[PDB]
Design a protein around this nucleic acid. Structure first.
Ligand SMILES: [Zn+2]
Lengths: 140, 113, 439
RNA sequence: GUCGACGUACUUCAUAGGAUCA
RNA sequence: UUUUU
């Protein structure tokens, strides 16, 4: 009901955006702030969301990625619970978007981007060049 | 005593031994031909595979390895070397294409679940 | 016409051929009439064929079948020079040579053709030299009852009825007796023989018919099991009851050991999948039937075309129904010439590489390469005379087909200038050793 | 002069790799 | 096909 052909008529500001594990790496690599970078790209308030699978995925990374773990635990970033055994974040992220059509997916993996692309009405955010880019979001 | 003489001989053999590996190790060090090093590497991977010297990776070990690969994406064509070869028509050649594909299949392995 | 078993010594292939009987044999058949009254013999061949094509006498028994048992017995007589033995018709030199070679591989004879202590020890049994060696090594971990049953079954012949000689019922009985192992014909035999032990005497006949089992052979297998257990108990220290033959299931550890004891007697009949040696010539696909997967026996005489040496799985083996790829190496009892001019091998059981090297170490069928070098593989040197290293064992005897086994960590000691392998080492044992010298 | 060298502008040849299925 | 301590 939220989808008009390929146009999602439910996703409206402020946006709820799921943070993928690799998104944080390139956000750090490009010196782009998570909260403001999304604000600049979309010109709207963004509510970043980190699920348990990505959060567990981050902790397994090791001491090298301590900064990303610290940023992931910033109080502004809300947490999303998981009711599934598997810890694979890509499978978790694909699952949630299918259930409810309100989430932006912020990621940089080519494989996960293709799977989300096949799902209709899912805006897909990525970090490239110097700042964030949003692909399938007409209100921009 | 004469046992001291036995000690010197045992040391002498050990010293003569260490030199032999040093001479052989020095000579193999200088040879850095791709074909020669490629043949040695292939034979080594067979021996380790055949003798199973390497321990089996636990599911948790594979997950950690997969996590780092997703975190970094180090084995795609966006790397400096891969991008340099691709953009300048050096990958049309067979040999440098094999190295690129070797890199890509290795990345795919770590992506497997 | 008579169906004779012809044994081709060159390739070890057994063939059954229908050919003309000898004149004496025909005369003997004609003699069956005339025992109770004047009689007639109607021959279905012309006198022209008889006078020309029929041999006067059939070839003596000695010149047609293996002589390894006889050589061992005569060597136990201290008849060292079998060639000068006054035979009625001396056996062929080639047959004698392979008999000596087979005995040497089994450890019966030393390199100078004298009887070893094992050779004397095998001659005390009523079995072929191969089957003795199986019983010889069975002492470990109470495996003796299983080896006796296996040995008796093979010594007497197969109590199984084949599909050609005869469907759901047949496979149902087969399913029950293959449960011990999915890669062994031998353990299928052991399953039946030991299963019979729990059958009460009254139901034994119903069991044999229900399972397509030849009645006569199993009864002799029972009888021959008692005689073996009698000779061993009597000569090891004797009344044996039917209770003595009752035995429980082998443990997983035992089953692996039985494969090793079985391989002890058939060290010379190990076959390797051809794709392992010559992947170009033997291209195996997932569509290829298991029955059509080529194998190469050890010590096979090399031909210009390697396909001439190929050996395929027999239709009767359980492996044809295995459903996955067959094991890397296989033990076979004998080779039969199929109707398609394809050699078929009667499998015994699968053997892994490292155990196979262990057993062949005591035989003349294993040689060691030079120490390996590289990451992980490093020749640890305790002293000028002893070291720890990885070597590649070569299996098989350069005119034959030998192949290299997986590398195995060994302990070597320098003896009279030559490095001699003392003992094998596990991967953990070598790794701890590499650590110890570092500390 | 179907001339040599250089400069300039273009054309062209070297791309498939793994898994499954028949 | 036979057959053996
Ligand atoms: Zn989840």
């Amino acid at each position: 009901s939220a989808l008009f052909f390929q146009y999602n008529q439910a996703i409206k500001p402020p946006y709820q955006v799921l943070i993928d594990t690799n998104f944080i790496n390139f956000s750090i690599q490009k010196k782009v702030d998570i909260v403001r970078g999304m604000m600049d790209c979309l010109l709207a308030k963004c509510n970043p969301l980190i699920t348990d699978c990505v959060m567990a995925e981050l902790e397994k990374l090791g001491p090298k990625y301590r900064i990303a773990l610290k940023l992931a635990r910033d109080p502004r970033i809300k947490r999303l619970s998981c009711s599934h055994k598997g810890t694979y974040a890509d499978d978790c992220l694909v699952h949630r978007v299918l259930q409810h059509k309100c989430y932006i997916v912020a990621t940089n993996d080519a494989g996960l981007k293709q799977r989300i692309r096949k799902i209709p009405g899912i805006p897909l955010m990525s970090v490239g060049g110097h700042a964030y880019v949003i692909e399938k979001l007409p209100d921009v | 005593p004469e046992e001291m003489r036995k000690r010197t001989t045992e040391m002498r053999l050990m010293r003569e031994l260490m030199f032999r590996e040093e001479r052989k190790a020095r000579r193999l060090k200088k040879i850095k031909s791709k074909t020669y090093r490629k043949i040695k590497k292939k034979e080594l991977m067979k021996n380790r595979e055949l003798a199973a010297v390497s321990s089996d990776e636990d599911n948790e070990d594979h997950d950690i390895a997969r996590a780092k690969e997703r975190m970094t994406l180090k084995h795609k064509t966006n790397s400096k070397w891969a991008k340099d070869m691709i953009k300048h028509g050096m990958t049309n050649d067979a040999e440098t294409r094999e190295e690129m594909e070797e890199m890509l299949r290795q990345g795919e392995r770590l992506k497997a679940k | 016409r008579s169906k004779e078993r012809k044994y081709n010594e060159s390739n070890g292939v057994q063939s059954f051929e229908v050919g003309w009987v000898s004149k004496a044999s025909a005369n003997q058949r004609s003699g069956r009439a005339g025992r109770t009254g004047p009689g007639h013999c109607y021959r279905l061949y012309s006198s022209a064929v008889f006078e020309h094509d029929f041999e006067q006498f059939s070839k003596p028994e000695i010149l047609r079948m293996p002589v390894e048992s006889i050589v061992l017995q005569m060597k136990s007589m201290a008849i060292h020079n079998i060639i000068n033995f006054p035979f009625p018709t001396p056996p062929d030199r080639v047959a004698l040579s392979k008999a000596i070679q087979l005995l040497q591989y089994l450890g019966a004879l030393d390199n100078k053709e004298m009887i070893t202590e094992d050779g004397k020890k095998m001659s005390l049994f009523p079995l072929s030299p191969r089957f003795s060696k199986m019983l010889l090594v069975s002492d470990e971990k109470a495996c003796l009852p299983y080896i006796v049953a296996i040995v008796s079954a093979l010594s007497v012949g197969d109590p199984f009825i084949n599909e050609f000689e005869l469907r759901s019922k047949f496979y149902k009985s087969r399913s029950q007796f293959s449960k011990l192992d999915k890669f062994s014909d031998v353990f299928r035999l052991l399953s039946v023989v030991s299963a019979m032990d729990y059958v009460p005497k009254e139901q034994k006949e119903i069991f044999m018919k229900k399972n397509f089992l030849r009645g006569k052979l199993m009864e002799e297998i029972v009888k021959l099991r008692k005689q073996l257990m009698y000779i061993i108990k009597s000569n090891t220290s004797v009344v044996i009851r039917n209770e003595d033959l009752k035995s429980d299931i082998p443990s997983v550890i035992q089953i692996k050991l039985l494969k090793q004891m079985i391989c002890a007697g058939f060290v010379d009949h190990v076959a390797v999948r051809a794709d392992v040696l010559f992947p170009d010539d033997a291209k195996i696909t997932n569509r290829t039937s298991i029955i059509n997967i080529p194998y190469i026996p050890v010590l096979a005489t090399r031909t210009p075309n390697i396909e001439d040496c190929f050996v395929y799985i027999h239709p009767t083996s359980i492996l044809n129904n295995l459903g996955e790829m067959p094991p890397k190496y296989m033990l076979y009892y004998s080779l039969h010439l199929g109707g398609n001019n394809k050699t078929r091998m009667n499998t015994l059981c699968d053997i892994a590489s490292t155990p196979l090297a262990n057993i062949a170490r005591k035989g003349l069928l294993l040689t060691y390469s030079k120490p390996l070098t590289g990451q992980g593989l490093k020749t640890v040197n305790l002293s000028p005379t002893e070291r720890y290293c990885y070597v590649v064992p070569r299996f098989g005897s350069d005119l034959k087909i030998g192949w290299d086994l997986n590398p195995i960590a060994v302990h070597q000691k320098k003896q009279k200038g030559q490095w001699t392998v003392i003992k094998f080492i596990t991967r953990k044992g070598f790794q701890t050793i590499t650590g110890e010298e570092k500390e």
